[PDB]
């Protein structure tokens, strides 16, 4: 829950099912 996290499309983002 961090607003300063990357708002763009990211290949290195979490590819899991994290809800």
């Amino acid at each position, epitope marked *: 829950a961090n*607003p*300063n*996290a*990357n*708002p*763009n*499309a*990211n*290949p*290195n983002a979490n590819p899991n099912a994290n809800p």
Partner: antibody, heavy 123, light 107 residues
């Protein structure tokens, strides 16, 4: 030629509502998170809201939270900003800015800005 | 809420001078700092991102230094196109801007 074009600004009275739209072109609008930044007449820069690349996350400044609503249409390359219960202090020019692209965990600076749109709130 | 404080507020200089603008943060922001240039009526323009990196297409005479709470925008040799207002911005805890430094022509 990557550009951002704000529009929809005008003169409104207190309590009334207005809708701003910012049309993107030249790049892939669906891959970028967007911001709204306003600048009151003769003053500095103030942040309004941010939306994620897929609209899954939205954050607002405390000065507009509950009153403003950010949104986007990735099929028409358009960012929106719904301004409800407008106040006199909301009078400013409203810019839409693009977050610079990085593969890192954190967001970057605003690397592309629009020409702005003037919103005037006065009875 | 992080507050950014620029100094000076106004600055007179002639073409060819070395110009140094400082920007102070109310708390540590690591290197999450940006520098913008704005001319009257026009939009802001990204100059420096992440404290020191030069934005592509921005002339090399623009440098940025600093980390933590004290930062510096330096124009190594002022040019006639550089007379404008410069803003610093932190993007570590939400997004806040400084009040700006106006680079004026000296006579």
């Amino acid at each position: 030629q990557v550009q951002l074009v704000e529009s929809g600004g005008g003169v409104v009275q207190p309590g009334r509502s207005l809708r701003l739209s910012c049309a993107a072109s030249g790049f892939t609008f669906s891959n970028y998170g967007m911001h709204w930044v306003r600048q009151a007449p003769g003053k500095g820069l103030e942040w309004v809201a941010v939306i994620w690349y897929d609209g899954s996350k939205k954050y607002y400044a405390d000065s507009v939270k509950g009153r403003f609503t950010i949104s986007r249409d990735n099929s028409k390359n358009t960012l929106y900003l719904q301004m409800n219960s407008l106040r006199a202090e909301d009078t400013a020019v409203y810019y839409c800015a693009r977050v610079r692209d990085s593969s890192d965990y954190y967001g970057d600076a605003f690397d592309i800005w629009g020409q702005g749109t003037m919103v005037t709130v006065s009875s | 809420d992080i507050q950014m404080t620029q100094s000076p507020s106004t600055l007179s200089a002639s073409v060819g001078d070395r110009v140094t603008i400082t920007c102070r943060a109310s708390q540590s922001i690591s290197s999450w700092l940006a520098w913008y240039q704005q001319k009257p009526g026009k939009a802001p323009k990204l100059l420096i991102y992440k404290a020191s990196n030069l934005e592509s297409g921005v002339p090399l005479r623009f440098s940025g230094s600093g980390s933590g709470t004290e930062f510096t925008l330096t124009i190594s040799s002022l040019q006639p196109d550089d007379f404008a207002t410069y803003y610093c911005q932190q993007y570590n805890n939400y997004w806040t801007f400084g009040q700006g430094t106006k680079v004026e022509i000296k006579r």
